[PDB]
Structures are given as C-alpha cells and as structure tokens.
Amino acid sequence: SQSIIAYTMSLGAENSVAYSNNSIAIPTNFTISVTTEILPVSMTKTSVD
Amino acid sequence: ECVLGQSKRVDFCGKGYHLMSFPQSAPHGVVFLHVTYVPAQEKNFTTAPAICHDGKAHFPREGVFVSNGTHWFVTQRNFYEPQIITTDNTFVSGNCDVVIGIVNNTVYDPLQPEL
Amino acid sequence: ECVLGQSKRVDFCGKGYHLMSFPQSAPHGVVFLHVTYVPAQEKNFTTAP
Amino acid sequence: SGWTFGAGPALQIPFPMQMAYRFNGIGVTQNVLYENQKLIANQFNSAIG
Ligand SMILES: *[C@@H]1O[C@H](CO)[C@@H](O[C@@H]2O[C@H](CO)[C@@H](O[C@@H]3O[C@H](CO)[C@@H](O)[C@H](O)[C@@H]3O)[C@H](O)[C@H]2NC(C)=O)[C@H](O)[C@H]1NC(C)=O
Ligand SMILES: *[C@@H]1O[C@H](CO)[C@@H](O[C@@H]2O[C@H](CO)[C@@H](O)[C@H](O)[C@H]2NC(C)=O)[C@H](O)[C@H]1NC(C)=O
Ligand SMILES: *[C@@H]1O[C@H](CO)[C@@H](O[C@@H]2O[C@H](CO)[C@@H](O)[C@H](O)[C@H]2NC(C)=O)[C@H](O)[C@H]1NC(C)=O
Numbered sequence: 001s002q003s004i005i006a007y008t009m010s011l012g013a014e015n016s017v018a019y020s021n022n023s024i025a026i027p028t029n030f031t032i033s034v035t036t037e038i039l040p041v042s043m044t045k046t047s048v049d
Numbered sequence: 050e051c052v053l054g055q056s057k058r059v060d061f062c063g064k065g066y067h068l069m070s071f072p073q074s075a076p077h078g079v080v081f082l083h084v085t086y087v088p089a090q091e092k093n094f095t096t097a098p099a100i101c102h103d104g105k106a107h108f109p110r111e112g113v114f115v116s117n118g119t120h121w122f123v124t125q126r127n128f129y130e131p132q133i134i135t136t137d138n139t140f141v142s143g144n145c146d147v148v149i150g151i152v153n154n155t156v157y158d159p160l161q162p163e164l
Numbered sequence: 165e166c167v168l169g170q171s172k173r174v175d176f177c178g179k180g181y182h183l184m185s186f187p188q189s190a191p192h193g194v195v196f197l198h199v200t201y202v203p204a205q206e207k208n209f210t211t212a213p
Numbered sequence: 214s215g216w217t218f219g220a221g222p223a224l225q226i227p228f229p230m231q232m233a234y235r236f237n238g239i240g241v242t243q244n245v246l247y248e249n250q251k252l253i254a255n256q257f258n259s260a261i262g
C-alpha cells in the first residue's frame with residue numbers, strides 16, 4: 001500500500017576522517033569533469049501609450 | 050575570467066580545479082560549460098617534516114616526504130610519483146636539533162660516483 | 165574563497181597576508197574570523213641590482 | 214583535511230604540515246615555521262583568546 005508520511009529532514013552521512021600526526025593521503029589517478037551553468041541576460045522591450 | 054583565461058578563485062568557474070570553459074547562446078541567456086580536474090584513488094603513507102643527515106637538516110624543495118614501510122621517497126603533492134632523495138631536490142637549513150619529528154635517512158650525492 | 169581556500173585578493177579576507185578563516189553563526193547572520201600575517205621590526209641595508 | 218575537501222575527496226594531513234603549505238603561499242619559506250613553532254602557537258592562542 002501507499003501513503004503520505006512526515007518526518008524530520010537529515011543533512012548527510014557521517015564521514016569521520018582518520019587523523020593522526022604521522023599519516024598523509026595522496027591521490028593516484030584522475031578524472032575529467034564537465035558541468036553547465038545557465039544565466040539570463042535580458043528581457044522583452046515593451047511600450048504602452 | 051573563465052573563458053579568456055584560467056581562474057584561481059574557488060568555486061567560481063565550476064567545482065574542482067579549473068581547466069577550460071566554453072560558451073553557448075540561448076534565448077535571452079547564456080550557457081557555460083566548465084571543464085575541470087578531479088583526483089581519485091587515494092592511498093596511505095607515513096610522513097616526516099625533515100631528514101637529518103650528518104649534522105644537517107634537509108627540507109624538500111617542491112614536494113613532500115613519504116614512506117612505504119621501509120624506504121623513503123619524495124613526491125609531488127597532487128600526484129603519486131616517488132623519486133630517490135638527492136641533493137638536487139632538497140635544501141639545507143640548520144641542524145637536526147630544533148625540529149620536532151625529524152627522522153634519520155641518507156641523502157645521495159650525484160657527484161662522487163662520477164669521480 | 166576565504167574558508168574553502170586561500171585568497172590572493174587584497175583586503176578581501178582581512179587586512180594583511182591571508183592565512184586562514186573560520187565561520188560562526190549568529191541570529192540572521194554570519195561571522196567570519198580571519199587569521200593573517202603581519203611583518204615587524206624592520207632594519208636598514210644597502211642594495212645593488 | 215585543509216582545502217582538499219572542497220574540490221573532491223577529503224585527504225588528511227597533519228596541521229603543522231598544512232601551516233607550512235599556507236606559509237609557502239605568501240612568499241615565506243617553510244623552514245621558518247618549523248623553527249618557530251611554539252612561538253607561533255602561543256601567538257595564535259593569545260590572539261584568539
Ligand atoms: C584511472 O582511471 C581510468 C578511468 O577513469 C582507468 O582507465 C580504465 O582502466 C580499466 C582497467 O584497465 C579499463 O577497463 C578495461 O575494460 C576492457 C573492456 O573495454 C576490458 O577488456 C579490460 O580487461 C579492462 O577491464 C577501462 O577501460 C579504462 N577506462 C578508460 C576510459 O580507458 C585507469 O586505469 C586509471 N588508472 C589506473 C592507474 O588505474
Ligand atoms: C617499498 O619500496 C621499495 C622500493 O625500493 C621496495 O624495495 C624493492 O622491492 C623490489 C621488489 O621486491 C626489489 O626488486 C628491490 O630490490 C627493492 N629495493 C631495494 C633497495 O632492495 C620495497 O619492497 C617496498 N616495500 C613494501 C612493503 O612494499
Ligand atoms: C605523534 O604523536 C605521538 C603520540 O603523542 C608522539 O609519540 C610520543 O613522542 C614522544 C617524543 O616527543 C615520546 O617521548 C613518546 O614516548 C611518544 N609516545 C609513544 C611512542 O607512544 C609522536 O612523537 C608524535 N609525532 C610527532 C612528529 O610529533
């Protein structure tokens with residue numbers, strides 16, 4: 001069956017980092033990413049008498 | 050700033066390290082395509098701030114010191130590429146008695162085997 | 165630009181040479197703490213090109 | 214982590230080692246911090262207090 005439910009929103013998932021005074025992490029291989037962005041520039045020219 | 054050059058401002062021309070950007074036109078607007086760079090496939094290493102040779106302290110010129118359990122290397126910060134420590138990628142300043150965490154190793158000099 | 169990175173724009177994240185920045189929340193607003201670097205105790209020298 | 218968590222996965226690094234990275238970004242060599250660590254820490258604590 002289906003229904004409508006109400007709850008309290010969550011913010012994310014815990015990602016506790018392993019911190020010490022002697023350890024470092026270095027990446028080894030890479031990816032290329034392409035994203036998009038949209039921006040309005042103008043509107044319509046109207047005139048009223 | 051994004052199309053006619055390369056930007057250093059964070060999160061301005063996309064999310065990541067900026068490489069390029071391309072424009073396109075839309076009715077009453079513009080569209081930008083941002084091309085960036087993302088790291089991946091991290092690993093684990095042990096680090097030290099300096100290396101104490103005989104009475105001298107050596108600091109890395111452009112990279113960082115790492116270890117794989119038994120041997121020490123110097124690598125660049127954004128990509129894993131280990132190289133043998135020499136006198137051409139380190140510089141000397143002082144003696145190994147003031148730095149906290151200085152370790153022992155040897156530094157290879159690329160002149161003695163020549164003569 | 166100040167919290168997620170290190171800035172080179174002059175007088176953007178505080179007065180001096182930017183090092184770090186920390187956020188705090190306030191009723192209907194935000195507060196930034198900027199940590200910078202200031203020189204001191206100058207001297208005198210003779211220079212040549 | 215530093216500034217690595219704003220442009221991808223988070224990578225850990227000791228704080229005194231990150232302070233040298235941030236010192237290199239303003240024109241001062243990184244051997245200055247390692248030989249004045251206690252004084253810099255005391256100044257930071259006094260300034261934030
Ligand atoms: C860095 O990441 C890239 C991808 O983002 C890795 O390239 C990928 O490597 C795998 C393993 O060699 C390739 O899989 C191959 O697929 C063929 C079928 O097409 C299969 O017959 C092979 O046995 C193998 O599984 C994959 O195609 C390749 N991706 C691309 C786009 O070429 C790369 O290996 C990573 N670097 C390191 C050092 O792992
Ligand atoms: C850490 O890296 C070093 C790289 O020198 C490894 O030592 C080499 O291992 C290969 C493969 O067994 C040998 O052919 C070389 O002779 C070794 N080098 C020397 C100087 O003897 C070492 O095995 C690595 N350690 C771990 C735990 O992976
Ligand atoms: C990393 O942290 C550890 C734990 O605080 C430090 O280990 C101690 O170092 C002191 C010397 O400063 C020794 O007297 C202790 O016996 C060590 N504790 C151990 C081995 O359990 C370590 O020095 C720190 N590393 C750096 C570079 O500061």
Ligand SMILES: *[C@@H]1O[C@H](CO)[C@@H](O[C@@H]2O[C@H](CO)[C@@H](O)[C@H](O)[C@H]2NC(C)=O)[C@H](O)[C@H]1NC(C)=O
Nearest residue numbers: 100101102103104145146150151152153154155
């Ligand atoms: C690095 O090597 C040096 C010399 O091989 C060590 O310095 C000696 O340390 C021992 C005990 O730590 C002292 O009894 C000697 O007097 C020291 N020698 C000199 C000439 O001062 C040093 O301890 C080594 N590094 C570490 C972390 O143990």
Ligand SMILES: *[C@@H]1O[C@H](CO)[C@@H](O)[C@H](O)[C@H]1NC(C)=O
Nearest residue numbers: 017018019023092093094095
């Ligand atoms: C990296 O840290 C230590 C050192 O190798 C290792 O035991 C650990 O499993 C690795 N991963 C994480 C998340 O700490």
Ligand SMILES: *[C@@H]1O[C@H](CO)[C@@H](O)[C@H](O)[C@H]1NC(C)=O
Nearest residue numbers: 205206207208209210211212
């Ligand atoms: C620095 O300039 C000269 C050169 O040493 C010296 O006589 C003078 O007192 C110093 N201070 C100032 C403010 O000029």
